[PDB]
Design a protein around this ligand. Structure first.
Ligand code: NAP
Ligand code: FOL
Length: 186
């Protein structure tokens, strides 16, 4: 019933990861933005669901797992059970989305947030339906081994403004960045 959204922070060269962590040092307010967007439900009494691949799960500091105030679902074709601390395990994105509509989660979940990595971002971005991409543009090149798939800029349109999102250039640790929101309607 809820909205479907991706969220990512990406360097100019399209990098999202390096050696199992982010390519840039911790940007505390950028992380707080990730937290606010993924945690804030549009319905009282419901939580959002975060969907992530297995490497993304383990890249989150253990102290912060599961991500508090959100239902945490990990994608894996190999695991028999969710990793310790995770709430659910699914074998595919479509299986995960189906789970959200079944009775165990139907009255519990509002928004769905896809939080990486590359494969699930690519599949989500091309999935039919209304979809928004919350993209933080890190305005430097960073050496990376994991990349965000190219956004089709005819398919997706940049919203000029977005409620609850700062428009001005931000800067932490000498790294400038800006928050963007893209949308497709089907
Ligand atoms: N900058 C950012 O916004 C951001 C966001 C997310 C991640 N990251 C970074 O990106 C890296 C992790 O991402 P990644 O792309 O390497 O890995 P990932 O997608 O998180 O994990 C890959 C593994 O997840 C499982 N998987 C992925 N998609 C699946 C699907 N659709 N269905 C079933 N299983 C699926 C597979 O595990 P099995 O072999 O067990 O099946 C696969 O080997 C880290 O460096 C992390 O720090 C950055
Ligand atoms: N905008 C954006 N920035 C990111 O850094 C980001 N990272 C990932 C995957 N990596 C991670 C790594 C750590 C945490 C994390 O520890 N978050 C906690 C603490 C946030 C904080 O301290 O401010 C959380 O409660 O969300 C989340 C995602 C996916 N989407 C992103 N999206």
């Amino acid at each position: 019933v809820g909205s479907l959204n991706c969220i990512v922070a990406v360097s100019q060269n399209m990098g999202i990861g390096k050696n199992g962590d982010l390519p840039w040092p911790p940007l505390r307010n950028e992380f707080r933005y990730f937290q606010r967007m993924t945690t804030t439900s549009s319905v009282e009494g419901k939580q959002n669901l975060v969907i992530m691949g297995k490497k993304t799960w383990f890249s989150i500091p253990e102290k912060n797992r599961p991500l508090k105030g959100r239902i945490n679902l990990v994608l894996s074709r190999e695991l028999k059970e969710p990793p310790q601390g995770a709430h659910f395990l699914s074998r595919s994105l479509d299986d995960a989305l189906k789970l959200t509509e079944q009775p165990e989660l139907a009255n519990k979940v509002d928004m769905v947030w896809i939080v990486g990595g590359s494969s699930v971002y690519k599949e989500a971005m091309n999935h039919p339906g209304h979809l928004k991409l919350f993209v933080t543009r890190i305005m430097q090149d960073f050496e990376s081994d994991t990349f965000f798939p190219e956004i089709d800029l005819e398919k997706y349109k940049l919203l000029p403004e977005y409620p609850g999102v700062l428009s001005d250039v931000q800067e932490e640790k000498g790294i400038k960045y800006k928050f963007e929101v893209y949308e497709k309607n089907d």
